């Protein structure tokens, strides 16, 4: 149960926060789990999604099929996965979107900032 | 009013203990479903907000 008066428990106010959030607040709302062996390697539970991160879809019609994240579409909370597409009328590919909390991160894109983030949360490489 | 003088205390492990407590005098007081209703009826309107 919430006890702080700094937090709120309002469907109206919490949804206002969710869809009124800007990108620098949406980058934490779009997080992803880590693979079990990788989760314990860095001793961290979940990390925010990122372009060029190798992931496997776990839920939906595209369950199981892996790939990377071509680009993270923050304004609608979606992940664009290469080769996970859809045949439009005109034969082109309109790539379907997957939410960040369904996929699982298998291979991270090791940036200098990501490494600091790992060791910041009591982790290690 | 005669009823059940002693109650038995249960340890953490679940086994009864040899110690006992006399049933408190409150546990024989009148049981009044109407009086509890018309008091809960009132006392429950005391954390209300005005609209």
């Amino acid at each position: 149960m919430k006890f702080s008066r700094d937090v709120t428990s309002s469907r109206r106010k919490q949804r206002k926060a969710h869809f009124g959030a800007p990108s620098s607040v949406r980058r934490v709302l779009m997080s992803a789990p880590l693979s079990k062996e990788l989760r314990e390697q860095y001793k961290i539970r979940s990390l925010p999604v990122r372009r060029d991160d190798q992931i496997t879809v776990i839920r939906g019609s595209n369950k199981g099929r892996e790939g990377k994240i071509t680009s993270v579409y923050r304004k609608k909370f979606l992940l664009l996965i290469e080769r996970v597409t859809r045949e439009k009328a005109n034969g082109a590919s309109a790539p379907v979107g997957i939410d960040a909390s369904k996929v699982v991160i298998t291979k991270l894109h090791l940036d200098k900032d990501r490494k600091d983030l790992i060791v910041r949360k009591g982790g290690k490489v | 009013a005669a009823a059940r003088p002693t109650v038995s205390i249960y340890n953490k492990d679940g086994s009864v203990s040899s110690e006992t407590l006399a049933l408190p005098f409150v546990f024989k007081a009148p049981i009044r479903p109407d009086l509890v209703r018309s008091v809960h009826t009132a006392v429950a309107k005391n954390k209300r907000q005005p609209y």
Binding site: - | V16, P30, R32, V43, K45
Partner: protein
């Protein structure tokens, strides 16, 4: 609708203590516990007392 409606209701204290002494008394009768929906068909004893 007016905010000065009667929201809070007065009960004498000796009415409140009676309703609560009665409320405590009826928590020692197992029948009034089952009949309220409590799943205490395997409770070792009522009133149920543990140690400190």
């Amino acid at each position: 609708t007016k905010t000065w409606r009667k929201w809070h209701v007065k009960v004498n204290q000796n009415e409140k203590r009676y309703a609560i002494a009665s409320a405590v008394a009826a928590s020692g009768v197992p029948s009034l516990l089952l009949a309220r929906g409590h799943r205490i068909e395997e409770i070792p004893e009522v009133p149920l007392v543990v140690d400190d």
